[PDB]
Scaffold this active site. Structure first.
Site, PDB file in Angstrom:
ATOM      1  CE  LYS A  14      -9.606  11.163  44.451  1.00  0.00           C
ATOM      2  NZ  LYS A  14     -11.382  11.986  44.382  1.00  0.00           N
ATOM      3  CG  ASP A 129     -23.524  12.488  41.393  1.00  0.00           C
ATOM      4  OD1 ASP A 129     -23.730  13.937  40.123  1.00  0.00           O
ATOM      5  OD2 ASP A 129     -22.784  12.939  42.051  1.00  0.00           O
ATOM      6  CE  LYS A 131     -19.311  10.291  37.646  1.00  0.00           C
ATOM      7  NZ  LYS A 131     -17.933   9.661  37.305  1.00  0.00           N
ATOM      8  CG  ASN A 134     -19.923   5.715  39.051  1.00  0.00           C
ATOM      9  OD1 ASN A 134     -19.474   5.848  39.857  1.00  0.00           O
ATOM     10  ND2 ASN A 134     -20.922   7.690  39.061  1.00  0.00           N
ATOM     11  CG  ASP A 150     -19.517   5.953  43.537  1.00  0.00           C
ATOM     12  OD1 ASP A 150     -19.162   5.747  44.816  1.00  0.00           O
ATOM     13  OD2 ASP A 150     -19.026   6.756  42.151  1.00  0.00           O
ATOM     14  CB  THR A 169     -19.533  15.189  35.791  1.00  0.00           C
ATOM     15  OG1 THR A 169     -19.013  16.284  35.823  1.00  0.00           O
ATOM     16  CG2 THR A 169     -18.287  14.518  36.845  1.00  0.00           C
ATOM     17  CE  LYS A 409       4.664  14.009  13.670  1.00  0.00           C
ATOM     18  NZ  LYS A 409       4.727  15.553  13.311  1.00  0.00           N
ATOM     19  CG  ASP A 437       7.170  22.422  17.111  1.00  0.00           C
ATOM     20  OD1 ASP A 437       8.284  23.895  16.114  1.00  0.00           O
ATOM     21  OD2 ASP A 437       7.829  21.008  16.512  1.00  0.00           O
ATOM     22  CD  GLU A 448       6.801  17.817  18.755  1.00  0.00           C
ATOM     23  OE1 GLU A 448       5.284  17.708  17.984  1.00  0.00           O
ATOM     24  OE2 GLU A 448       7.369  18.011  18.003  1.00  0.00           O
TER      25      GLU A 448
HETATM   26  C1  LIG Z   1     -12.948   2.124  39.825  1.00  0.00           C
HETATM   27  C2  LIG Z   1     -12.362   1.374  41.467  1.00  0.00           C
HETATM   28  C3  LIG Z   1     -11.808   3.245  41.787  1.00  0.00           C
HETATM   29  N1  LIG Z   1     -13.467   0.970  41.823  1.00  0.00           N
HETATM   30  N2  LIG Z   1     -13.711   1.695  42.469  1.00  0.00           N
HETATM   31  C4  LIG Z   1     -15.229   1.167  42.977  1.00  0.00           C
HETATM   32  C5  LIG Z   1     -16.388   1.708  43.908  1.00  0.00           C
HETATM   33  C6  LIG Z   1     -16.137   1.565  45.584  1.00  0.00           C
HETATM   34  C7  LIG Z   1     -15.118   0.473  45.823  1.00  0.00           C
HETATM   35  C8  LIG Z   1     -15.028   0.262  47.453  1.00  0.00           C
HETATM   36  C9  LIG Z   1     -15.679   1.076  48.127  1.00  0.00           C
HETATM   37  C10 LIG Z   1     -16.829   1.967  47.707  1.00  0.00           C
HETATM   38  C11 LIG Z   1     -18.039   2.222  48.588  1.00  0.00           C
HETATM   39  C12 LIG Z   1     -18.797   2.951  47.749  1.00  0.00           C
HETATM   40  C13 LIG Z   1     -18.963   3.717  46.380  1.00  0.00           C
HETATM   41  C14 LIG Z   1     -18.503   2.933  46.384  1.00  0.00           C
HETATM   42  C15 LIG Z   1     -17.411   2.074  46.787  1.00  0.00           C
HETATM   43  C16 LIG Z   1     -14.396   0.033  43.384  1.00  0.00           C
HETATM   44  C17 LIG Z   1     -14.692  -1.220  43.320  1.00  0.00           C
HETATM   45  N3  LIG Z   1     -16.211  -1.797  43.841  1.00  0.00           N
HETATM   46  N4  LIG Z   1     -14.110  -2.348  42.911  1.00  0.00           N
HETATM   47  C18 LIG Z   1     -12.944  -2.344  42.130  1.00  0.00           C
HETATM   48  N5  LIG Z   1     -12.514  -1.413  41.572  1.00  0.00           N
HETATM   49  C19 LIG Z   1     -14.027   0.345  42.379  1.00  0.00           C
END
Ligand SMILES: CC(C)n1nc(Cc2cccc3ccccc23)c2c(N)ncnc21
Length: 459
Positions: A14, A129, A131, A134, A150, A169, A409, A437, A448
């Site tokens: 995701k 964004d 971070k 990314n 991104d 974020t 823990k 608990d 837990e």
């Molecule tokens: C961490 C995992 C969720 N992940 N995420 C990406 C980024 C990504 C993938 C495909 C299309 C895109 C289009 C616009 C911006 C980012 C994109 C990505 C990647 N390139 N390669 C491997 N894993 C990826």
């Protein structure tokens, strides 16, 4: 149409604005990554004239520190952004495994980020964004190239207020983004925050929860008061001051940041400076990454549990409808059709087709011999109560990773931090802990902790 050219092979994870699937060109066999953005779930900011135009520009740009975009598709429900796949994982997940980490290592990392950012800003593309999440690696190694993912997305799509999407974020967002008037300089600020973390292992603007952090970002005050900053050059600190300058017009550009003495001196191929290990920063960055990943894992675990409740109900209804005899026992063919019906029923599913293998794997457990028919009630449980494995194993892994001393823990102070990051109210998690608990004396084991998360999502 996307499915005419590409087939999904496996889920990568995701990401911001939608799930990322590893796909393969049906003809050439070329592997790619596709981000699927739901037009229902995700709001558009601009007109499609603007979106299509930015996509076409991105297709023509190339830089070794920027993710390569190949193609764009759309249907009634989704956008499909197709680009290059990187297999090295996230930068910080690589850093935490290192035994040694110096200013030189930090400088090499930040030079790559600044190089990519400088190139995109030249083309009037802003990230906003930026971070650690990314920053992907081409391979899990300190020598691998960084690829920023991104760029440009936030200009065209609105971020969700769901905490699982906006966890972590606050540390990196520029103050001027909070107030609404921002430009490319916001990316220099986020990079400055990342540099500050690489050199100290601690965010410059820190806090127990989103509000506390954002309040510190907005005030804009930070210091080098922490002891580990004595191990850091004044040149490094000077660059951080220029990148974390409050008024954006007075803040250094990405281009000029690349020319800074620190970058020039510490990114030489031949190391000619002192390179003491920033050992305290490594310990801190492990603790930081650990906390961030456990909080993320917890929310994803709670989300997956709720999703499984819904799917358990819907899947039983489907089989009940198919069960015309009323004996509760179906065959392989019927079970596959029902599972496939479920994945369509809940429109918000992954792009994958994973049902038939799942069915056979469930049947192996439920009836190895395959004598005949299957209690569909037994199938549903094994189908759902195992399919949550991904999130359950990830939660345990994140718990173990976080527990660096292998104590088994997590303390009340750590819980306060973890839940604060997760937007779980103080009195609420303490109340749930008390229910789990009565004789807890300020610490929980994994089970837990898991029990707390279940009570926090209505279970
Ligand atoms: C961490 C995992 C969720 N992940 N995420 C990406 C980024 C990504 C993938 C495909 C299309 C895109 C289009 C616009 C911006 C980012 C994109 C990505 C990647 N390139 N390669 C491997 N894993 C990826």
């Amino acid at each position: 149409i996307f499915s005419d050219r590409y087939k999904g092979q496996r889920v990568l994870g995701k990401g911001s604005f939608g799930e990322v699937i590893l796909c393969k060109d049906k003809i050439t066999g070329q592997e790619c990554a596709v981000k699927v953005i739901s037009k229902r779930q995700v709001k558009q900011k601009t007109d499609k004239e603007s979106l299509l135009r930015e996509v076409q520009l991105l297709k023509q740009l190339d830089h070794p520190n920027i993710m390569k975009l190949y193609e764009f598709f759309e249907d009634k429900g989704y956008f499909y952004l197709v680009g290059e796949v990187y297999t090295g994982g996230e930068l910080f997940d690589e850093i935490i495994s290192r035994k040694r980490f110096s200013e030189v290592d930090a400088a090499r990392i930040i030079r790559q980020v600044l190089s990519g950012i400088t190139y995109m800003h030249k083309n009037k593309i802003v990230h906003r964004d930026l971070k650690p999440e990314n920053l992907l690696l081409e391979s899990k190694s300190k020598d691998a190239n960084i690829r920023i993912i991104d760029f440009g997305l936030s200009t065209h799509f609105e971020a969700s207020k769901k905490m699982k999407d906006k966890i972590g974020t606050a540390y990196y967002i520029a103050p001027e983004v909070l107030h609404g008037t921002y430009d490319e300089k916001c990316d220099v600020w986020s990079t400055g925050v990342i540099l500050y973390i690489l050199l100290s292992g601690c965010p410059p603007f820190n806090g127990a929860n989103e509000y506390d952090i954002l309040k510190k970002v907005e005030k804009g005050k930070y210091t080098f008061e922490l002891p580990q900053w004595k191990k850091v050059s004044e040149s490094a600190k000077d660059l951080i001051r220029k990148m974390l300058t409050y008024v954006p017009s007075m803040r250094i550009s990405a281009r000029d940041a690349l020319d800074h003495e620190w970058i020039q001196t510490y990114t030489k191929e031949q190391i000619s400076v002192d390179v003491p290990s920033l050992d305290n920063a490594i310990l801190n960055i492990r603790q930081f990454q650990g906390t961030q990943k456990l909080a993320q894992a917890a929310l994803l675990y709670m989300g997956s549990k709720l999703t499984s409740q819904d799917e358990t109900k819907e899947l039983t209804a489907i089989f009940h409808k198919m069960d015309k005899n009323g004996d509760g026992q179906l065959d392989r063919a019927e079970l596959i059709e029902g599972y496939k019906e479920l994945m369509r029923m809940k429109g918000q599913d992954a792009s994958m087709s994973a049902v038939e293998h799942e069915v056979d794997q469930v049947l192996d457990a439920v009836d190895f011999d395959k004598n005949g028919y299957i209690e569909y009630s037994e199938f549903v449980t094994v189908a759902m109560d195992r399919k949550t494995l991904l999130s359950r194993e990830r939660l345990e892994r994140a718990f173990r990773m976080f527990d660096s001393d292998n104590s088994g823990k997590i303390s009340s102070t750590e819980l306060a931090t973890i839940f604060g990051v997760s937007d779980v109210d103080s009195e609420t998690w303490k109340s749930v802990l008390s229910e789990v608990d009565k004789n807890n004396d300020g610490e929980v084991d994994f089970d837990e902790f898991q029990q707390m998360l279940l009570k926090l999502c209505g279970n």
